[PDB]
């Protein structure tokens with residue numbers, strides 16, 4: 001069961017956040033980890049494409065080098081709070097799992113600035129709730145969480161201590177594919 005009480009950023013600047021460029025996940029807090037050890041890497045891009053708000057996802061597993069992608073049209077619920085009916089796709093946009101009733105995630109932008117952000121997500125897959133996941137984002141992958149986003153972590157009643165860093169986890173990314181998926 002995810003919480004719905006994550007508060008959107010006051011004065012959220014949606015154009016700066018959804019500018020079509022990549023956000024890297026630098027640190028994350030998964031409140032319901034899979035029983036199997038999975039130290040993944042993730043990044044995302046979001047912005048307008050042919051008049052729609054779109055969000056593409058990338059995940060990388062260093063153990064296998066396996067990759068997975070997703071793309072959604074976003075639906076604004078309220079300011080800074082969105083719902084995404086995802087479809088799983090190859091790096092070229094070919095559909096692996098279609099848009100389905102029980103598959104969706106929601107997110108809230110709790111904090112953001114030109115370079116960083118903190119978001120809450122709640123993922124639903126096959127109708128089941130997979131729990132809360134908080135991500136600290138940055139426009140640069142090797143950048144450490146600065147004071148402002150750490151303040152936002154505190155303001156959300158969390159401890160930065162509990163977060164897991166992707167910094168020396170052998171991550172590799174694919175921003176070209178991630179950006180071009182916005183049109184698919």
Ligand code: HEM
Pocket residue numbers: 025028030034038039040041042044057059069070086087088097105121123125133135
């Ligand atoms: C912005 C941050 C993230 C978002 C929006 C997000 C979103 C998603 C989505 C939509 C899926 C379902 C994919 C599909 O089946 O088509 C997924 C699966 C998964 N994600 Fe993430 N993810 C995020 C960050 C992360 C991070 C940092 C990790 C690292 C542990 C992670 C681990 C996983 C795992 C293990 C699964 C497979 C879950 C299952 O089917 O049981 N994700 N993610």
Ligand SMILES: NCCc1c[nH]cn1
Pocket residue numbers: 030031032033034121122123130131132133
């Ligand atoms: N238990 C974490 C669910 C999740 C994975 N990705 C996004 N959310």
